[PDB]
Ligand binder design. Sequence first.
Ligand SMILES: OC[C@H]1O[C@@](CO)(O[C@H]2O[C@H](CO)[C@@H](O)[C@H](O)[C@H]2O)[C@@H](O)[C@@H]1O
Ligand SMILES: OC[C@H]1O[C@@](CO)(O[C@H]2O[C@H](CO)[C@@H](O)[C@H](O)[C@H]2O)[C@@H](O)[C@@H]1O
Lengths: 335, 335
Amino acid sequence: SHALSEIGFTKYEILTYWTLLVYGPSTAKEISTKSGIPYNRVYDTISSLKLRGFVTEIEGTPKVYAAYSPRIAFFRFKKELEDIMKKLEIELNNVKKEEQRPAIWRSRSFDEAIEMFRESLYSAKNEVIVVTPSEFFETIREDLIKTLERGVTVSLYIDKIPDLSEFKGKGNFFVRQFYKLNHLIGMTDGKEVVTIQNATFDSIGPPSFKSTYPEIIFSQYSLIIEIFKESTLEKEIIGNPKDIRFFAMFHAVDFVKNHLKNRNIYAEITGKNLESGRLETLTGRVVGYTLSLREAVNNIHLETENGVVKVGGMFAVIEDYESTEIKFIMGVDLQ
Amino acid sequence: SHALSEIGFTKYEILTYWTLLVYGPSTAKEISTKSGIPYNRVYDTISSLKLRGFVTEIEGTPKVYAAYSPRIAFFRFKKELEDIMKKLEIELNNVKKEEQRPAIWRSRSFDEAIEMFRESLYSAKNEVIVVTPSEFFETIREDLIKTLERGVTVSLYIDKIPDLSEFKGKGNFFVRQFYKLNHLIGMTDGKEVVTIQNATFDSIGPPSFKSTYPEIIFSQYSLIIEIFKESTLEKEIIGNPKDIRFFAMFHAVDFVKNHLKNRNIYAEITGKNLESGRLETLTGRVVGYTLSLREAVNNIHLETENGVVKVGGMFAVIEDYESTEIKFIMGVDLQ
Ligand SMILES: OC[C@H]1O[C@@](CO)(O[C@H]2O[C@H](CO)[C@@H](O)[C@H](O)[C@H]2O)[C@@H](O)[C@@H]1O
Ligand SMILES: OC[C@H]1O[C@@](CO)(O[C@H]2O[C@H](CO)[C@@H](O)[C@H](O)[C@H]2O)[C@@H](O)[C@@H]1O
């Protein structure tokens, strides 16, 4: 006897009690219509399993039936989910509304977290800041690259600077070093944050999560600026001098700082007009910045069509514009 | 409106129509008890999804609910299958009967085939012969090694000999070269065969399959002997001189041929006694072989406790013993 088990139950989460009790036998021995003996005579269950891909029937006289192994049997079932999921993702893109309550999704484990991290990076349109412990880098190496290729800027914060050869042309890549980081923070387009805690789930420690709550974004944006203040800029790769993107204005300004002197810079910015609240797209020359760390101010001075303006980043209040959507196009080498 | 879709149906393969229509909304927008509006008032469906891991609820006044993405949502569902599958595999091992009708399982694609190949290798207890086109090698490189480590002998047939450094101590590895091979044949312990056709599923070409039918084993064993006759022996790695295993006596004998001269060899064989039909385990010294290719004979002459005997491989009829279970232990270097 197969002897069933609790397994019986779970599978009755989705599975017939006949569809369950026909497969049981075929795995435990492999007959034809002996199945039909223990215990119901109807073979409808077999016509079932055949479509699921859990059984094929082989030339017969009498006809005989055989079960694929758990491994192959579910490999097929998993492959089915992929399709529900992707097709489900695809429709979402064509009909998902935009104004959504903020929330927070906790993750059950390191893998699942990395899954949430990747999902986030995939959506990146402008910049992603990734604070990480050297330990994790090898796990995100491909995703970093893939992202960089969509022309998205990537601001990395790492402790032990790895071998960055793979990256020589891949995109707009900035690398900064910092004493030591414990967990992985990941922020994409100033829109959402995803976090992963060091190594294995370390017993009862902080949870790994994604979140869109302003408080946590503000929290974390502020955290990053602190690590920025002490961090040192080790690698800079402009693989796209005519489309350099930032969501983090302090990163914007860091960059402008390094170049504005030896060449002109042009900008296109979308942002809230602090005076009016209205969204606007602005273009001009960058003719100055202020990056005052104690004063807590970082912004750009943009020469638009009609006068200078100041554009500051997320949560700005004192400049003319608040922006998290920034594009520099770089003037020419000489000057 | 989410607008449902065919997707609705499939998911009703397993999923409630409420459990399906609650998730729909949370993905399309993210509220609390607005769900309850369109269209049923009962929130039992939410208590459902919560256990599936498809939704968490967040601190409320009122209380509010949010859905994980398809990606994470199913990542969790897949992770569940793993457990049904493994737990299901585990029990099988403890209760699966042995005498089973022969059958044949066709595979739907290259991946699934490779899945069947691996599954087979995993079970290897003695030897696996793997005829393969150079193209596939990188896909089986790890599995080859893993297998080699369980102390299992691995007889490879390849066309373009790859870099075999990874393998210097890994096990008992024999490598033979052959002009060109089109598809992957894989035979494990003379018990079952698994086959994969070149590259992508090439439209309407031969199917990829596993099978235990004697005819196909005999077929394929015979096929391999042909490729053996023309093939050349390029690499030989005895990483286990005291336990060298074969299921293919012609491979046995090839080996004995190369060594018997410069050192003694000992054997332990399990096989059918052709005179009596009875199974027996025999041990002795190997004092000779015959490997006559035209005559279609290959066997070993074993000096047992009480006289010489001849042991031939699968399907043997003229020797004293038919064996597919063979272990040589190698005498010492000098002589
Ligand atoms: O940098 C200080 C801190 O204050 C906030 C919130 O009011 O606003 C500043 O942020 C801008 C860039 O993001 C500054 O340039 C601007 O002067 C000011 O609004 C946060 O943004 C920031 O964390
Ligand atoms: O090698 C010939 C061919 O004939 C078979 C089937 O009768 O039997 C031979 O196989 C043995 C090794 O497997 C030989 O040594 C033996 O003499 C003979 O039984 C098949 O085995 C084989 O394909």
